[PDB]
Chain length 333, copies 4
């Protein structure tokens, strides 16, 4: 029902667009990307190495991108403040370029007529929200918000269930993460983050992520109680979280399984998943969950000290959450 | 000085041979592998996808594998007890087939004239040793010993330094593991371990490992205080250990760095490495250390709860330890 | 209508089974595989790293494999002559183990009551058939036949069109081929084919193939006019043929495009594909064509000397052809 | 002996620097790169995912990059005309940024006092040279030249031997090429070349290359008689050429082997290699040859129609040729 503009037609931009048209929860009416012209958008959206060919129709007609018969205005602006979202009827803008993550930078979309902006990444100052965890804390005074990172959306739902039931005194997270567009095919320049410049195909690359720390924002009680890091590895998609945490109340591993499974079947349905199957990463490709608990993979040293494993399609899960978030916001208007 | 025989000419058998000739600490004089004839041995030893072409000469001559002008007797016996080690002058035998890990089976080499047997893998009932950790516990009454696994050799030296200085109350370990020969190119049968059957190129694959528990043996005080698991990922060589542990005594991260660096420069020199460089996995290709502490990659939530990162060439490092162990044994004769 | 048994429930076995339930052209009533028990078959069939989770239902009940409600008898015989195909009602047997490719070896299935056998690979003496090329040469007197290789099924339909219109004087073919189950994850023993033993993730591996020569069997006029080789590269699925040939009659590239596109829409519909899109290998994953001509990728030096490019899902395309051929065989009974 | 400056410290820039110091054929005295400061240069040059840690010393001292005790002046100029090559003592300048490949653009280095410029890539207008083929056609009047491409340097030497002995009537080339810096980790924008934007790890990507056509310039007699294309595949380094050519004079394959081997041991020593071993791509990592003929991989349909295979380290071979070319220029001077 809410009309949506997308800034940055990349992995997230394109898959948010897919999620939108597949679910019908929001309507994409405009897209901006200076480095992808209209004809190129048809090809990039239609064919996808990771998630296969788009199920539906896409073509260019009269300057518009037409997906499933729905025309979309196409902009080619480098400067976000110059995009005429208002003229196109875009009420919400998905900010998914990755270079406008502050409220100041993302707020440029308001000058073009956008009413609200959703940053598809962590923000230094924008309020972050995770569906199933704190999305009800949103209110209509917030015109610029963040949907956090893919990793945060994996960790937070799980952390909520564990904290709600047993309490997390302290925890340390590792994520084995699929490669992304920011990495390099071969050893190349990355002056700010030297390790991230090394060849992505050849290397396990340790990386710093504020994902664990970010969970402290969407779940205030866990503020300062979580830290983590990442290992980037040569897979095209799907990542996994490794949460090692100390519980303040005792819990058998079966108790943990029970409460997680219960959550996945109820209040966190579609967000937090649960499995006992012998899964590997490819089994979660195009899976729309934010987080899927791997029961068989976890290990318990004692009732107070455990390692919990959760899978996530970093591309497809997060993209769907962006749509869910916007659908929820629209319902409050 | 001591003469060595090698049963099995796989990744380990061949790299023990390389380490032996490169370091010159021992002399290979016999090899046994049914599935590999003499001409093929030259090829497999000379050319290596991971560690490159051998530095030195290798050729067949008079039915002998000649490495660096040193002839080596070859055997093709499927039954270990049928190998004439004594005739070829082999004092120590490196059992590296991986199917004779028990005291009974491994002892078969003795029947042939072998004086001592070194198992290059975990054993269910043979005394396990890790250089730098408990190798001084070796005495001359032991005829059949084990050098534990590649991962145990990475974790134990670090675990020793941390335990000796601050005391590990408890710890959970993750290892991001490069692919191995037991895995499959595409989804194939692995009846006992279903996840391991899945395509190695396509998947992050969780897997069980007894490395953390094995540290309990070589370091008795840590018995029952460590366990862990693995994630197999599509990289060719070099793995990494992720140890999340609670400490009883306070330990600022700078104090951890100090004691590990101190250990790397003194008693554990050559075994436990230390670095503050922005390293990735490939930087440890053909690194001979059992384990190299990654200072920049580790994180501390507080003085009692930390995540410690250590790299290892799961092939090269371990193979050299086997040679080092044999050299230590020879010095005790 | 015709009831089918599958020997060897591997990549081709499982995908032949998928193709059969998806097309409905035949009925799978029995499967044999000593190294995959009933419960394991459920897992291997349901989850696929390459082609995704099975669309439909699969489970074990009453000792039967039940797919979409249809019970399937499961055998665990190593000896082909000991499988009770007749009792299970299997009339045709798909021989897809890779180790019974001669008529003598494949004929063992007749002892257990099978009526005809279709070898899912090249055979040294069994008549080879390729859908769209020579399948109409099949007749009821042939009880054991071969569906050739994936590569042959790609090249032959293309070569047919080119020869029919312009005449191939001579040709040389290269196939850039995805990895398969026969390859190794790391340098391992392969005494018969040394290069094939080398790690499949790290290397481009030149390999021999009789695919081009086999086209001379299914297209007799081209006997002795074609030869080729292969490069194995680190991708999980989908391969491509590179055909360099001399033509007898003048052929503008636009004329080649015309006749190939004509064929793809007419008599070779569903077997030979045609595209002008900017495609890469993943765009053909789970594509059912035997061969898809890549218009933009090909090049013409002159009217008589050209390089033609054709893509194929080596797993999925070939598997459907096996089902197609069996349905055709049944039509001739 | 000749002092050299390097513009652009990328894969080629850095590996030309390695080649220079390893061979000692020229002296690097200056380097320019706006996107890599002094400290970062030390790291990027020392550590290399593909060719391992640099064998020697590297450090920053007094604003200089010091390799093996040799100080090197560092510039950070975006505009090549502003680089004081002269003051730094650099006579020749290797232009290896990939964005100054024209004579007008590369000529900017002369304004800074450089005497000659070698473009480490094909040029639209600068004369191209390939060591072993037409380097003797270089003369002192030429201030701005090109060393062509890696692929041209692989194909031309081979083409020379074949054309000289048997005459190439016509030929078509395919190169299976390892990934490069211009490719993307995941589906991303590549506006002028759509296929090159697709994920490099996931895809076999067909691509255009003027390598075969370029051979016609370094070998005038073959002008218009060759063309080709490339398949990009997910390997970090080492590529292979596949030359399918028709010959005017009869040539048994043994005769082809003979003349190629003969050249590898004589005038083309170090440029054109010859092997009959069962090699795979990784065996040529850090191989300094421009082209190594794979005797066992090639095939002949008849005495006039053959497919010849040749390997090349696209990074290391080319870099050493840049140095050889400069050394040759200096010998004339
Ligand atoms: N890929 C993931 O798994 C993932 C998951 C969660 C969040 N994110 C975050 O989403 C954001 C985008 O990530 P991505 O993977 O889609 O990267 P991407 O490179 O695939 O896409 C980003 C793009 O935005 C375009 N762009 C660049 N500058 C622009 C500008 N000034 N104006 C408009 N468009 C511009 C680019 O052409 C490109 O298409 C990042 O912040 C990322 O951290 C990514
Ligand atoms: N993978 C491809 O792309 C492709 C394409 C065309 C043809 N083929 C051919 O099909 C055949 C199988 O190929 P694949 O890729 O499925 O190999 P695969 O290894 O994936 O499966 C073959 C199997 O047969 C089973 N098996 C082994 N011995 C058996 C026995 N005595 N009895 C019953 N089952 C047994 C194995 O358990 C395994 O499941 C081969 O001949 C192959 O050349 C493969
Ligand atoms: N990589 C190969 O295999 C190969 C083989 C043959 C030829 N080449 C050619 O060599 C050239 C470089 O290729 P590459 O593989 O090293 O890619 P690369 O990305 O690694 O190197 C290009 C670089 O030059 C730097 N640079 C960019 N703009 C600059 C500027 N204005 N001034 C100074 N430095 C600048 C960049 O920091 C970067 O290091 C290309 O033209 C390529 O076609 C590459
Ligand atoms: Zn039932
Ligand atoms: Zn028919
Ligand atoms: Zn010009």
């Amino acid at each position: 029902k809410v009309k949506v503009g997308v800034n940055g037609f990349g992995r997230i931009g394109r898959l948010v667009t897919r999620a939108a048209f597949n679910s019908g929860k929001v309507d994409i009416v405009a897209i901006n990307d200076p480095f992808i012209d209209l004809n190129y958008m048809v090809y990039m959206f239609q064919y996808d190495s990771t998630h296969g060919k788009f199920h539906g129709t896409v073509k260019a007609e009269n300057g518009k991108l037409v997906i499933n018969g729905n025309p979309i205005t196409i902009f080619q602006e480098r400067d976000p403040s110059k995009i005429k979202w208002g003229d196109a009827g875009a009420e919400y803008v998905v900010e998914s370029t990755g270079v406008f993550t502050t409220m100041e930078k993302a707020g440029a979309h308001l000058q073009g007529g956008a009413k609200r902006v959703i940053i598809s990444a962590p923000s230094a100052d924008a309020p972050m929200f995770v569906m199933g965890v704190n999305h009800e804390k949103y209110d209509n005074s917030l015109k610029i918000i963040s949907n956090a990172s893919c990793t945060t959306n994996c960790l937070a739902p799980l952390a909520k269930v564990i904290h709600d039931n047993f309490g997390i005194v302290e925890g340390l997270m590792t994520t084995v993460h699929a490669i992304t567009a920011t990495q390099k095919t071969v050893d190349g320049p990355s002056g700010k983050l030297w390790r991230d410049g090394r060849g992505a195909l050849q290397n396990i690359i340790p990386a710093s992520t504020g994902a664990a720390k970010a969970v402290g924002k969407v779940i205030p009680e866990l503020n300062g109680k979580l830290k983590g890091m990442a290992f980037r590895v040569p897979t095209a998609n799907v990542s996994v979280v490794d949460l090692t945490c100390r519980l303040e109340k005792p819990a058998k591993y079966d108790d943990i399984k029970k409460v997680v499974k219960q959550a996945s079947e109820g209040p966190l349905k579609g967000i937090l998943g649960y499995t006992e199957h012998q899964v590997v990463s490819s089994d979660f490709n195009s899976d729309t969950h934010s987080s899927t608990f791997d029961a068989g993979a976890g290990i318990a040293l004692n009732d107070h000290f455990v390692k919990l494993i959760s899978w996530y399609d970093n591309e497809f899960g997060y993209s769907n959450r962006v749509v869910d978030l916007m659908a929820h916001m629209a319902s409050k208007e």
